[PDB]
Design a protein around this ligand. Structure first.
Ligand SMILES: CCCCc1cc(=O)n2nc(NCc3ccc(Cl)cc3F)c(C#N)c2[nH]1
Ligand SMILES: CCCCc1cc(=O)n2nc(NCc3ccc(Cl)cc3F)c(C#N)c2[nH]1
Ligand SMILES: *Cc1c(COP(=O)(O)O)cnc(C)c1O
Ligand SMILES: *Cc1c(COP(=O)(O)O)cnc(C)c1O
Ligand SMILES: [Cl-]
Ligand SMILES: [Cl-]
Lengths: 360, 353
């Protein structure tokens, strides 16, 4: 039986910290945090407490066997100062799937969402309202068994921290990135856990990113299979806007076959494009073979990443088999990207009412 | 650069805990621990201090992006109370490889080994001397960047804790649905991220009435590892040659110290062929049918060697005749390792504390 929002204990900070005035992503945090403990007596009472360190037993399974998962979603403040979360129910669904996959304790998705609402409500003055700004919300659930046996934990901690974030692009002007496409590096496997947002999926990628930077590329294009399927780009889902081999203009993204993290932005872009009804929208495997041919015949319009922190990011270059492939995204507007960006902005900041937004 | 054992800060406990008066693995800890911090100024001085909680920033990258690795090795007390570590140099080598894979700070392997030596010396009375008992040594290195960016940490924490620790065969679930590791992955490194996802799979093994997981890989159903242990098969191979085989280090196998030691020991005897080669379920099935399998077992620090008596491969329940065959090889390995570990026979593999 879940923790309940009705049982929320509150403790306000003695000295509130000074809000920012050049804000680096995920390094500046708000005054408060959510915390819930779980043990053999079930879930304790959720609490909003001042931001503070975690105290953990040195054998905590969070630190030895990676019993850890997280989420990431944004809250946006409109002109009327109303704060809204973007499609948070989907992050809750995803968090619960991750928790089950790691044998961590189940919780009630709406009870968590309400606790998170109360938390953002407490720190509402931390949500900025300038162009391209938002509050990043980082829920985390960790095992906390003081035992070196690889086992299902009998203790766990669930916490939530918040970070104001600035505009990823200057004045809403998307800047494109180069990608390294080397099949030696494999992010995730069918049957694995690449489709869950587990800490374990990220640490091994840090050296890969370093190797991309050494080869003059900004991010990693994650390839999979003997046919070099394009799966994800960095920590973002990948989209291609092109005329397909059958002559039909389409937006394509790889399907959810196990090696793809099902992004909330990804699903939202698919939803928006289907709603327009102006071109084919499909989830299909994308191979480097298909991409190279389409690039020779001039059929590729736009390539981009999607994800909460950066929203939509264009791609202009891919290094594959030591050969640079120019991707004509910025030449094609990038009008699909600019259109998505505009419609999402209107929804996120309340310019258009939308059921996707959850009011705080 | 590296922290130096010569700079060791020492804080003896004021509240020593009563030692155990049966020990469940990895749940009882000794009075002290090693702790060393790293940042933009480099490594601080190492410190032996009383066992105590860690204090971590809520955004610590150890907890969000699994910038974490660990080791496991054993110290053994002989009759004359001399304590010795088993091939600790190899764990230092492996830990450093793990650190490099996760963009965590390098350190001097001999400096850490001396710090561990000093720690175990402080807690020497915790090293039990009963037959089959030992002290388990758990070094850990974690990233500790207070930042939600997926990036190389600018801070890290290295610590070491100790557990005193106290042949019945096991059954295995062999289902190709379950994948421990993949070629191009990090299953060949001792990183925390490799273990969390196995907990649900082990629960499935228990639900199907098995005790551990036989990790299968590839279209030919290769036997890779068993639970948290490397796998060995002792058989007469299809070419009629008596052989000890274990899977090769081709990316999906954690290079065990016990595993290497068993290969070293058997190769040195020169009595039978000792190879690193993949082992497939098809080969195992045929070998069992023809009565060529002698012994199957896992190897690893915590349990040393564990015989296997049954494998459930989908719906086919396979008897493995390990115990009916002595298990002669298992017993010989256990006997010769015991002689070395407890100082009965002086050996270069042992590092005195
Ligand atoms: C899963 C991690 C959640 C928070 C987070 C951390 C982080 O470092 N990044 N980096 C991102 N974007 C970099 C990037 C830029 C262009 C392209 Cl094509 C691909 C990329 F990965 C994001 C995001 N979104 C993010 N999120
Ligand atoms: C990588 C984890 C290091 C510490 C540790 C934890 C743990 O749970 N185990 N379990 C072990 N043995 C169980 C077992 C029994 C028989 C067989 Cl065939 C396979 C098995 F995994 C070990 C060890 N060694 C261990 N170590
Ligand atoms: C978080 C994440 C995404 C994008 O998810 P959103 O829910 O859109 O923020 C894509 N790929 C990977 C690997 C991720 O971790
Ligand atoms: C630690 C470990 C082993 C065994 O290693 P030893 O060095 O012999 O203790 C085997 N397999 C896996 C997956 C491991 O983590
Ligand atoms: Cl999915
Ligand atoms: Cl290796």
């Amino acid at each position: 039986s879940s923790f309940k929002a009705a049982d929320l204990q509150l403790e306000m900070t003695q000295k509130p910290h000074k809000k920012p005035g050049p804000l680096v992503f995920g390094k500046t945090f708000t005054d408060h945090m959510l915390m819930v403990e779980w043990n053999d007596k079930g879930w304790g009472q959720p609490r909003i407490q001042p931001f503070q360190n975690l105290t953990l037993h040195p054998a905590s399974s969070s630190l030895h066997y990676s019993l850890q998962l997280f989420e990431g979603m944004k809250a946006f403040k409109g002109k009327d100062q109303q704060v809204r979360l973007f499609r948070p129910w989907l992050n809750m669904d995803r968090m619960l799937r991750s928790a089950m996959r790691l044998c961590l304790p189940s919780f009630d998705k709406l009870e968590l969402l309400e606790c998170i609402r109360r938390l953002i409500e407490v720190d509402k003055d931390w949500v900025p309202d300038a162009a391209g700004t938002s509050l990043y919300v980082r829920p985390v659930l960790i095992g906390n068994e003081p035992s070196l046996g690889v086992s299902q934990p009998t203790r766990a901690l669930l916490f939530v921290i918040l970070c104001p974030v600035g505009a990823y692009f200057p004045g809403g002007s998307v800047t494109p990135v180069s990608l390294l496409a080397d099949p030696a590096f494999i992010r995730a496997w069918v049957g694995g856990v690449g489709n869950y947002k587990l800490g374990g999926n990220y640490g091994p990628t840090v050296l890969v990113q370093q190797e991309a930077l050494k080869r003059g590329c900004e991010q990693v294009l994650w390839l999979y299979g003997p046919d070099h399927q394009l799966t994800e780009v960095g920590t973002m889902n990948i989209f291609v806007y092109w005329t397909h081999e059958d002559g039909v203009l389409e937006l394509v993204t790889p399907p959810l076959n196990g090696v793809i993290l099902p992004g909330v932005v990804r699903q939202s872009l698919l939803d928006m494009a289907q709603t327009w009804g102006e071109f084919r929208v499909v989830e299909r495997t994308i191979t480097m073979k298909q991409l190279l041919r389409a690039l020779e015949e001039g059929r590729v319009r736009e390539v981009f990443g999607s994800g909460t922190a950066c929203q939509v990011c264009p791609v202009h270059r891919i290094l594959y088999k030591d050969r640079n492939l120019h991707i004509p995204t910025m030449e094609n507007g990038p009008e699909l990207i600019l259109r998505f960006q505009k419609e999402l902005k209107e929804i996120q900041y309340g310019i258009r009412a939308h059921e996707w937004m959850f009011p705080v």
